[PDB]
Amino acid sequence: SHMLFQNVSIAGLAHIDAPHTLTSKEINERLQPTYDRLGIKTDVLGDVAGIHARRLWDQDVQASDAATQAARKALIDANIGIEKIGLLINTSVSRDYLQPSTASIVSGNLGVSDHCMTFDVANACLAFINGMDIAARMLERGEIDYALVVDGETANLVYEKTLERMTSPDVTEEEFRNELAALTLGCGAAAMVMARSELVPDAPRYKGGVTRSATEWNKTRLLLIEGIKLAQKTFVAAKQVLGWAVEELDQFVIHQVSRPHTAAFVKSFGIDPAKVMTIFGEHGNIGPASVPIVLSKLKELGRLKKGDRIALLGIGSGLNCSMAEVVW
Amino acid sequence: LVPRGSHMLFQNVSIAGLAHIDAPHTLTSKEINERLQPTYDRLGIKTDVLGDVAGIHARRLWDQDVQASDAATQAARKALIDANIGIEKIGLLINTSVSRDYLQPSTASIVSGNLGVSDHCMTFDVANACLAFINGMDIAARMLERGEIDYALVVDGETANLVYEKTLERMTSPDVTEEEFRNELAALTLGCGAAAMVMARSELVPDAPRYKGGVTRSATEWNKLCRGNLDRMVTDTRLLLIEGIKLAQKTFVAAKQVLGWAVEELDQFVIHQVSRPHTAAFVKSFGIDPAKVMTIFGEHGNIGPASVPIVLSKLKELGRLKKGDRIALLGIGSGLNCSMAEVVW
């Protein structure tokens, strides 16, 4: 029945690590007076979540600037000039304005042609995979030759405000404990050039994927159990559409909320943890950029060889779950 | 005679259902001008820049507690009724509004939750200023044409309460400058409303309108011309007009090539509107007959990406559209972008 994409490729990919380190030891030294004025005595970031550091941008780097930097590096990786780009999609959570699209600002920075379509997709942590699928569909129909999918994430403001609130004399302990999860966010950026396969015949192939949703929960631990339920449904669809079995996939590129979230996931599906690269420990949760930043690292480290079957997945707020395949 | 390709236009994609919601509270330009009068006086403004220059006499607002997702949901339930289908048939739900409940999760996921979509339903938001509904329609059409889904919903709820409240405060300050007043005045041409469309594979709805898609051009060097956040919009009206017309000329050339358009053969032009004199300039530039151009701007203002489907819905409910009518969907959006697409009723 179902036909996958047969002429969609990944011509180039890149990531940008943000340059300022904020360690969890440092955050905890700033929060110590509060932690004690509440007899909190676990290191929740470092010991439970498993986040030892995250990166922050320079002052007033906007999402668009970070996404621009990643795009230029991706265009170098693909060996193509901006004038070949027919579609630029931005998929970040961080956005400069409500309007215009962050994509238009990125596109303007790069000097895209008057034929270049641009718009933003928002879907919490799954939006990069949504953008890749969007772009795939246009490539397949012959609308464009090349597409850029870009994502810049900024968390500088969220840290400033969250740590300012938490250290206030009024702050309660009910506050603290959800205010803490904002402290797992990290900065970073990624970009991908996709292309029609006849232009880049040796490049990795994007096959497509599946999505399942549980939007009864659009409003922590329940959500770890409910995300796993939804991922199980999604794997079943992936079996039927993609011909998946766990044992044959070479890498699982996942979205990363926490160490215990990842460990539950790998345990529930019987996946070899060695096939699951994580960067949360040093970068935190980089939202929808996490998946392409991990794939880019896998690439840059020489971990991917021709014919490797790569799963790209996550569980994102909604709840939604998407799983897609690349053949390297 | 000569075999020709489709020009990448969409095949066997239809509009199964369409609806709009008009926001309930009227805010007249007369009241707005009474609040602004002391500032008009101080800045020496003697013309009615809203009612007489922009051509907006009223706009609608929601109550302060209505979110984008709530408006969109209302319009989605009505479009499902129009398509005579239940929410279980929907495989894709895309939200296209400028207004948004949260940075995350998407507004689409909220609407989808409200409506009770199936676990098979794919949902996400698209953002592209006033063109996003068309982008949404195209994304859904790609899936429908390929046969991956049977039905899609594209939804858009716009809320302008906050921008009105905060703009009116700012523009009534005894200290506001002429330049700031001018920068923010276009905010007082926005309106509230909502629209939703059900798209389907044509096999399932053989008498329904067909959506062909169309063309897009951009001028992203002009991306600073109009910028908005939750409570403020700053716009260079003058350059938006000039650069928008230029862009639209380029995009009409493409439309001739791809859609076969000549202005005189179209039956209706559904045009996104920013002001009466920008609309007059656009219709005069391109030789369009003004009787083929429905306007709701005077009483509802500029509803952003919802404007085009709201006008299409009102044309449907007026009985203005007959089978075989060729309807052009046109807009210039902040970016700058320009899209032109065709519906065959």
UniProtKB/Swiss-Prot annotation, chain A:
Does Oxidoreductase show up as a keyword for this record?
no
Changing residue 255 to A/N has the effect of:
No change in substrate hydrolysis rate. Cannot form the beta-keto acid product
* Molecular function in Gene Ontology: 3-oxoacyl-[acyl-carrier-protein] synthase activity; metal ion binding
What catalytic reaction does the record list?
a 1,2-saturated acyl-CoA + an acyl-CoA + H2O = an (R)-2-alkyl-3-oxoalkanoate + 2 CoA + H(+)
Active site positions? 99, 125
Specify the domain of life of the species encoding this protein: Bacteria
Query: Where does this protein chiefly localize?
Result: cytoplasm
What controls its activity?
Inhibited by cerulenin.
Pfam families cross-referenced by the UniProt entry: ACP_syn_III, ACP_syn_III_C
Q: GO CC terms for this protein?
A: cytoplasm
Q: What is its EC number?
A: 2.3.3.20
GO process annotations (BP): fatty acid biosynthetic process; secondary metabolite biosynthetic process
Consequence of substituting residue 125 to A/S: Strong decrease in activity. Displays measurable CoA release only after incubation for 24 hours
Positions marked as site (Important for activity): 255
Q: Where does Mn(2+) bind?
A: 20, 58
Q: Which keywords label this protein?
A: Acyltransferase, Cytoplasm, Manganese, Metal-binding, Transferase
The EC class name is transferase
- State where the protein is found: Cytoplasm
Oligomeric state and interaction partners are given as: Homodimer. Weakly associates with the OleBCD complex.
Instruction: State the function annotated in the UniProt record.
Output: Involved in olefin biosynthesis. Catalyzes a non-decarboxylative head-to-head Claisen condensation of two acyl-CoA molecules, generating an (R)-2-alkyl-3-oxoalkanoate. Is active with fatty acyl-CoA substrates that ranged from C(8) to C(16) in length, and is the most active with palmitoyl-CoA and myristoyl-CoA.
For this chain, the family text in UniProt reads: Belongs to the thiolase-like superfamily. OleA family.
What does the record say about domains?
A: Contains three extended channels that together form a T-shaped, three-channel nexus. Contains an active site base originating from the second monomer of the dimer.
Protein name per Swiss-Prot or TrEMBL: Acyl-CoA:acyl-CoA alkyltransferase
